[PDB]
């Protein structure tokens with residue numbers, strides 16, 4: 001049966017939610033989207049409810065709405081944000097115009113936790129382990145996060161971690177901004193068709209920052225950032241240069257004075273030698289040669305957490321819709337079907 005819904009004004013819009021959800025309260029000061037904390041009286045869980053902003057206003061937006069719902073419905077993993085519930089107050093497709101998504105409420109993001117400070121090596125081990133455990137799962141479904149950074153890593157009091165915003169402008173990537181500091185060079189400057197290992201670069205940047213309390217590559221712009229990157233990892237060799245399909249980018253890279261890879265032990269003074277080794281394997285310029293999430297989990301740095309029988313992979317994820325061209329109402333009908341067919345977790 002259909003639950004009873006009640007109306008409330010929260011984030012300049014009227015939220016219409018099932019009675020089970022009580023004490024709705026906006027969180028994140030707009031940073032996470034139109035999101036409210038709530039108490040789910042049915043499960044006893046503290047939850048986060050996200051209302052999608054004008055989800056079917058254009059073809060691009062309607063497809064994005066479908067994409068996010070498909071992604072959230074697929075993800076069933078401890079270290080990845082998943083769906084506890086999805087609902088609409090609509091009784092039919094013709095009425096359908098709002099989508100509400102429900103997940104676990106997490107106390108903070110990693111960025112607000114790290115607070116300019118060095119973390120203990122054990123804390124770094126545990127946090128990075130969880131990120132890699134989640135990424136192994138995500139990557140096994142042929143999904144790429146693309147924008148992994150401390151602000152989309154949600155963490156509770158016990159340091160338990162869940163990955164937000166997976167699989168989803170020029171101005172906000174401009175300048176001295178955290179929005180670009182964790183990006184692999186190949187994607188930051190559109191060198192080539194990029195793969196899953198862009199996410200591994202990001203983990204390396206995050207891991208280094210947890211170990212030192214400092215941004216690894218705090219570039220003031222795209223060019224400044226590239227120079228910071230290349231000083232640490234060295235300028236590309238001939239092999240990688242061939243792989244830069246963008247003739248323009250390839251030609252610029254060649255104009256830079258060649259630099260050798262630095263000694264990471266001299267860069268990360270005092271750090272666990274195993275952490276240094278892993279950082280070296282993650283922060284490789286050639287993306288073909290970066291360590292994978294599955295491989296990184298088996299690295300000696302995670303000896304006290306690694307368990308090959310407790311690091312699950314995902315069911316197959318059909319993303320053929322990505323190369324499909326449809327009308328707004330067609331994307332909207334596909335979305336409606338996915339809402340209606342939702343089965344809650346036990």
Ligand SMILES: C[C@H](CS(C)(=O)=O)Nc1n[nH]c2nc(Oc3ccc(F)cc3F)ncc12
Pocket residue numbers: 027028032035036037047048049050072081082083084101102103104105106107108109153154155164
């Ligand atoms: C990280 C943030 C910190 S807080 C409570 O200060 O806003 N807490 C959050 N816990 N759970 C969260 N979920 C989101 O986004 C959602 C993602 C998927 C959903 F189904 C529902 C959501 F609300 N954003 C944010 C959070």
